[PDB]
Design a protein around this nucleic acid. Structure first.
Ligand SMILES: [Mn+2]
Ligand SMILES: [Mn+2]
Ligand SMILES: [Mn+2]
Ligand SMILES: [Mn+2]
Ligand SMILES: [Mn+2]
Ligand SMILES: [Mn+2]
Lengths: 116, 99, 115, 87, 99, 108, 83, 98
DNA sequence: ATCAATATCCACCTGCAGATTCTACCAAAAGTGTATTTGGAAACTGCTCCATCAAAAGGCATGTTCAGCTGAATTCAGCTGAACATGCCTTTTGATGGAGCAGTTTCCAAATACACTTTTGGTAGAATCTGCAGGTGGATATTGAT
DNA sequence: ATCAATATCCACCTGCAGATTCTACCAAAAGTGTATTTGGAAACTGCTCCATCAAAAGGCATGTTCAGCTGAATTCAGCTGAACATGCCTTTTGATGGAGCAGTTTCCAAATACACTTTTGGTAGAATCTGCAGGTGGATATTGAT
């Protein structure tokens, strides 16, 4: 090559930019939308089964559990935790914040009558 | 050895009949039916419980359609209570019409 | 005088008489075995059965719609949750009840949305 | 030796991401770093209470096996009625 | 002549007797007594109710002191319950042991 | 034989014969054991003493002989356990416990 | 000053007294109307049940018993008017 | 002239009302209100003197506590002045609205 | 800091209002003494269902880096509630018929209890459907840089 | 306001899990038909416990003035979210031994079912008293001003 046009023209496609990022909070909303649509449980089944067994064993030893007794506990456990968060959220928002804090969790329960 | 059965009643076939009445071409998973079954029993114990207490509150020893009716009113919210009562009375009236 | 336990006429269920799908026979029976009152009159089960049937029709009509909405034919627990939580009255009635595998209604607080 | 492994600190099986998921369904957009430990504590208590009653229901029936019925009854006591497990 | 009764049982005299055992020199407002009574009825109803349930769960026809015990274990907070159990067992034992 | 009530035998003040009659006619079950009413009676009485003890004390603190509703309330909401046992229970003419959120106290 | 409304009968100083027993120090001007509405819902719910008990009892007079029984259902258990 | 600072008289009023137990709404207005609402439910009703005292006891007991929770909400929001937002939030978490 | 105004205590003091002890009257409990019954425990045992092992693979959890943007701190004004001084309109406080809430007696519709006859819902085992969950692929939005 | 970069649809596809489908078996239901028991509607009638009036009483509505508190506006340190790399540990498919529920028969301890006797807690005045709530006096501690 010696011809007319092409001479060390390395900077031709300058429109190709570097990386990509979602602004903080965009993904968090994507996830909310995501989990609010589903019903699958969200705590890893085995770890949960173990916590249950640990607690139970510390109230009474040598105990057995129906697979479903454990599922029943998980179902109740998350249903409870999820609702707790809805309230917690509301408290944070009341303080004109967006970040839930323990302070909110505790106010939610105080009003609810769990540690009032 | 022996022939060891078990037997555990449900409202399943009945939930199903009604199911076919409202939406003829729809089905229901076993998990959902389990739930429908829980619901029915729940409401049943709630209504029967109300009735129970209502009767003692009045030194009554029998639970009649009348106790059931106010139990229903005490337990079911607005429009739903209104409709259950029509249905209840309706059924009772028709039942007693049998000679 | 046991000449009556024979031919002609023939039985008819009480649900049949009441005009119901639900078990008047079974309901009356459950009322006795639950120790609510000393005695239980005949109309008691008929009424209770009418009410229980009525309510299940209400939840099923509502849930079946949720089924249609999500292009499904077999109602699943999520359809039950949606139906209940979307109906003010059913929601009240089952306000201390948790339907396993039902999830929650999608709802994001306004102040959480972007600019 | 017969059997048995010691169960301890399983409360940590409640992973940061699992709790973050729960919050999301709960419609929570942002979370303070101190929430994970609070939540663990709150849950431990929730569980001890249901398990206590449930296991009490068990011991009463002269059983060594906790049934769904046990859990279901323990939950109705606490006012947390659960549908779906033989109510 | 007259002839008219009604009758109203109440836990009042047993309450009073107990007051005189703890604080022999302390009296009690009429309204205070009305509260104590309600209280005893309440706890009575709550306990019997729980024991009722225990029996059905186990498909049993009778409510024995075992039912009362666990019913108590469930209904009362830690210490209160611990003591109520011992008091309970004490009464029943003392009853059988001697007649 | 010269009769002496069940209460006497169980060694308590509360009416065993009554708790029994109440349980039967309560529609709680088909049958009722001989010991249930005794057990229950013991429990009712015991808790009755618990509250009276505590309220008796409240009276003495306010320098009073006769126990009134306020005394029963102070006694109850001041005890972790009795308070939990009565958390959804409101005692008429009992009022509340003195308590002011610190953030509200005077600045100096 | 003559033609009154009943819920308006629950006056500002009365509501103010309630708040104080509750430990409130400063009160927004809008709390009175808000409070009256809460009280109305409270009374409505309870009375609805009480009167339902009245009617069932074939009575034309609401007894303290009816009020108590209604409260127990609301989960508002009250000591002092029966048992 | 003499004059107490804003929030001082309120403070001792708290101290006083917390100490006592007397009802605080005026009896007749309350009587009238209860009867007015009941008429919507069934007409020509008599009210046992004790029925009304009960309702008043329950109502005030209810309101006082709602004011407790309400206070916590306001304070939660770095305030001292309770507003409608505070009653509303509390009722939501309490389950009476949410 | 020094009053000066109020509010808040403590010690008494005394009347009335609502606890007391008093007596006598039953019916209703509750105790006792037989008789008939039965719930549910013990003693097997058949047969779900739980605990436990194994072993391969993929979906998640952990840990770290980087910086957008959120909470928290500071400041400052307008303006919302608090404190205040009393007349006035309504809420207390009692008396006075009478409406109902209840004791009481009666009488029949309705509930039981008992014993055959009979219809029906639960289930164990196999056979055949069949919504639909995942897998794609590619058309359709939704972000975020610029 | 474009374009690029990802996420989000959304209908098409079909292989498997799980509904829906009979075959039959059977036991507990549920129903049908005399006989016996009784709970409560129903009519009355007395006796409280209400709703109504009047006078007699004590809090609320009002309007002014200003302290103080709530928000608004500004700033900035860093927490917390987004993304990325790596390696574990949950999830899954199977299979086994055996604890331990859950049937079944079988009795006796305990419980119901009358009947008879004794007692006792509730009630209705009737008289007796007593704890203590308002009232006083006066000291002293807060509160707010200068
Ligand atoms: Mn790339
Ligand atoms: Mn004396
Ligand atoms: Mn200036
Ligand atoms: Mn004055
Ligand atoms: Mn100035
Ligand atoms: Mn790792």
């Amino acid at each position: 090559l010696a011809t007319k046009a092409a001479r060390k023209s390395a900077p031709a496609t300058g429109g190709v930019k570097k990386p990509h990022r979602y602004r903080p909070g965009t993904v968090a909303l994507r996830e909310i939308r995501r989990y609010q649509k589903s019903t699958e449980l969200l705590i890893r089944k085995l770890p949960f089964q173990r916590l249950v067994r640990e607690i139970a064993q510390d109230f009474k030893t040598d105990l057995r559990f129906q697979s479903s007794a454990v599922m029943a506990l998980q179902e109740a456990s998350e249903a409870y935790l999820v609702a707790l968060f809805e309230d917690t959220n509301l408290c944070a928002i009341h303080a004109k914040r967006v970040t839930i804090m323990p302070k909110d969790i505790q106010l939610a329960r105080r009003i609810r009558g769990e540690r009032a | 050895k022996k022939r060891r059965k078990t037997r555990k009643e449900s409202y399943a076939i009945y939930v199903y009949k009604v199911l076919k009445q409202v939406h003829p071409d729809t089905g229901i998973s076993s998990k959902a039916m389990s739930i429908m079954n829980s619901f029915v029993n729940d409401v049943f114990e709630r209504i029967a419980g109300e009735a129970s207490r209502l009767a003692h509150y009045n030194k009554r020893s029998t639970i009649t359609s009348r106790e059931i009716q106010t139990a229903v009113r005490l337990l079911l919210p607005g429009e739903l209570a209104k409709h259950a009562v029509s249905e209840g009375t309706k059924a009772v009236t028709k039942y007693t019409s049998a000679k | 005088g046991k000449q009556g336990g024979k031919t002609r006429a023939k039985a008819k269920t009480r649900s049949s008489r009441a005009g119901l799908q639900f078990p008047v026979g079974r309901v009356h029976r459950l009322l006795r075995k639950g120790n609510y009152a000393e005695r239980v009159g005949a109309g008691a089960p008929v009424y209770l059965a009418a009410v229980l049937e009525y309510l299940t029709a209400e939840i099923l009509e509502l849930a079946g719609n949720a089924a249609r909405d999500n292009k499904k034919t077999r109602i699943i627990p999520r359809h039950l949750q949606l139906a209940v939580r979307n109906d003010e009255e059913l929601n009240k009635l089952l306000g201390r009840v948790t339907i396993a595998q039902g999830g929650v209604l999608p709802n994001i607080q306004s102040v959480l949305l972007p600019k | 030796k017969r059997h048995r492994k010691v169960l301890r600190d399983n409360i940590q099986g409640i992973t940061k991401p699992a709790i973050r998921r729960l919050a999301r369904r709960g419609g929570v957009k942002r979370i303070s770093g101190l929430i994970y430990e609070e939540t663990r504590g709150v849950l431990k208590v929730f569980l001890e209470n249901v398990i206590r009653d449930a296991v009490t229901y068990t011991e009463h029936a002269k059983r060594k096996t906790v049934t769904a019925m046990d859990v279901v009854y323990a939950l109705k006591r606490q006012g947390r009625t659960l549908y779906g497990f033989g109510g």
